Amino acid sequence: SLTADQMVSALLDAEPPILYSDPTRPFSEASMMGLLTNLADRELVHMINWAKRVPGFVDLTLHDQVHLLESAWLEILMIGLVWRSMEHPGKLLFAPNLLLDRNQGKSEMVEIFDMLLATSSRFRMMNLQGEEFVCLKSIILLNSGVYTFSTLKSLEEKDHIHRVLDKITDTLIHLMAKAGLTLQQQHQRLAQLLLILSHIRHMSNKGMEHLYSMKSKNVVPSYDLLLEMLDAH
Amino acid sequence: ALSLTADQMVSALLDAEPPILYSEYDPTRPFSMMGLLTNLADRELVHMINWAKRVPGFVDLTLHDQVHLLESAWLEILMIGLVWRSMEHPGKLLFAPNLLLDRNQGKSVEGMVEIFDMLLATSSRFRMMNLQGEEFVCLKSIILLNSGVYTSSTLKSLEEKDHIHRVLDKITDTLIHLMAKAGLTLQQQHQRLAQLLLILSHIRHMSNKGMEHLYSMKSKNVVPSYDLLLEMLD
Ligand SMILES: CC/C(=C(\c1ccc(O)cc1)c1ccc(OCCN(C)C)cc1)c1ccccc1
Ligand SMILES: CC/C(=C(\c1ccc(O)cc1)c1ccc(OCCN(C)C)cc1)c1ccccc1
Questions:
Q1: Contact A18/B at CB under 8 A
Q2: Which CATH fold topology does A1-233 show?
Q3: Where would you find this protein in the cell (chain B)?
């Protein structure tokens, strides 16, 4: 129902803050997973607030909202990381007080590290804009779990998600058209942006693989935990 | 290769299409699932290599970069093919014309039922979208070129990446042309382009789940090595 410009402003308004990591005591590479886990768990609370502010998301059932977040949360964390690392070549800006390069990633993730750095590089080359970024993040939330939900309710939920996804596509095209791009450039850029999302899913899968391999009780946010965070009064 | 028309690009991809293979099993014999699928895939991979070489722009790359792209994309390519020929068979996966299974038949293998349902959902989405053959071959070409392009600073590799992105742009223009030829409005054009490309994210996910299982098997030959792929390409 909203216009493209109304859509962008809504997404920009809903943006989560950049959080910080740790005492200015000596640094050690052993505590790296500790720092990143603490940060992530903290961001995830804010991500829930952001999601409820993505247009169309709260129109879904509580169950489907959880399913979408369950599928997308690490992808969302990762595109956020890649975004704030964009203007810091060769480094990943996990937090403003936690900026690491390749060699420091070797602490058992250097594979994922290199993949994130390459995505940052790609964003840099494409001159990715903030307005485009918030659209892509919204798309990840809506798309990542939409294929893994019969009932009439489900069919209506799926149709709604696809209609919102169509709206974000229109918004992306409008941003490019505002920027002065030709129709050919618009289509080509849209495609370039969406193809990156495949790589972000890949990195998320690799990351989730490690998280499950840790064999710890809450390393992956449970359905029940996500439900409680979403199901607010 | 970067000078073809949209129609020339399409006819090139359609002519390059690999054949549908059959499962190897005695049909007179009683009703091994992983054994059947592994044999099918291995035979399919040989034809996939011939196909890759006829994708415009691919052979312009170094043999090293060709192997890397195929390394990243081969199971994705097998899966989108599986989804495509399963499209007109709701609730079933058509692994081969003599091997059509439903939901409960994937339970024979650990974790397969998860993948099974994800594949069925993709075929359903394809059917809903009324995906066209010409669109399909474009999507499969995109998978080949895009999946490995993010995994360099050497002048040559900068040239290689540049080339891959120019080819991907050409396929994008081709997709748009197909849709414009079918009378879609500009809005419906870019909306459909987005819908199709977003499905490729789910296909990556399914490949990753599948790769996790193949690796979980402690077999030396199950995952095709760089050398094996280089032998086949070169
Ligand atoms: C790439 C960094 C990422 C972490 C991360 C990414 C982005 C960001 O903004 C913050 C952190 C990461 C690490 C741990 C983690 O699991 C903790 C989750 N809770 C839910 C138990 C999540 C992300 C990571 C994921 C898997 C393995 C190693 C590292
Ligand atoms: C989803 C079916 C797929 C098989 C398949 C995919 C596409 C196709 O057209 C036909 C069958 C499959 C299974 C194993 C496999 O690896 C074999 C090892 N070779 C590659 C050395 C490839 C495909 C599969 C992948 C992982 C585990 C179980 C099944």
A1: no
A2: Retinoid X Receptor (1.10.565)
A3: Nucleus; Golgi apparatus; Cell membrane
Q: Which residues 104-163 on chain A approach chain B with CB closer than 8 angstroms? A: 114-115, 118-119, 122, 139, 143-144, 147-148, 162
- Residue B76, annotated ligand binder? no
How far, in Å, CA of B19 to CA of B67, rounded?
Answer: 22
The best mutation among B45, B75, B84, B105 to test binding of ligand 2, ranked by most ligand atoms within 8 Å of the C-beta, falls on: B75
Interface contact flag, A194 B191, Cβ < 8 Å: no
Residues in chain B within 8 Å Cβ distance of A194: 194, 197-198
Protein fold of B1-234: Retinoid X Receptor (1.10.565)
Strand partners, A99: A93
- Residues flagged as binding site of A for 17beta-estradiol: 43, 84, 210
- Pairwise CA distance, residues A157 & A161, whole Å: 6
Task: Supply B41's token pair.
Answer: 């895939």
CA of A59 to the centre of ligand 2 (A): 39
Spatial distance between the Cα atoms of A81 and A86, rounded to a whole number of angstroms: 9
What is residue A101's three-state secondary structure?
strand
| Structure tokens given for B49 | 């290599």
Q: Do A148 and B204 touch (CB under 8 A)?
A: no
Total residues belonging to chain B: 234
Helix (H, G, I), strand (E, B) or coil at A20: coil
The DSSP string of A131-169 is: HHHHHHHHHHHHHTTTT----HHHHHHHHHHHHHHHHHH
| Helix residue spans in chain A (DSSP H) | 4-13, 32-51, 62-85, 102-105, 110-126, 130-143, 152-179, 183-213, 223-230
With CB atoms and an 8 Å threshold, state whether A148 touches B118. yes
| Resolution in Å, one decimal place | 1.8
For residue B43, say whether it is annotated as part of any ligand binding site: no
- Structural biology method used: X-ray
- For tokens 């070549």, the residue is A89
- Report the Cα–Cα distance between both ends of chain A, in Å, rounded: 27
As a residue count, chain A comes to 233
Q: Is A197 on the interface with B (CB under 8 A)?
A: yes
Give the pair of three-digit tokens for residue A90. Answer: 């060769």
In the numeric block, which tokens belong to residue B179? 């849709």
Tell me, yes or no, if B204 comes closer than 8 A to chain A by beta carbon. yes
Task: In whole angstroms, give the CA distance from residue B113 to residue B111.
Answer: 6
Amino acid identity of residue B11, one-letter, is: S
Phi, psi (deg, nearest 5) at residue B132: -100, 150
Each as own residue / partner, the long-range contacts of residues A23-30 (CB below 8 Å, 24 or more positions apart, any chain) are A29/A104, A29/A106, A29/A107, A30/A107
B191 CB within 8 Å of a chain A CB = yes
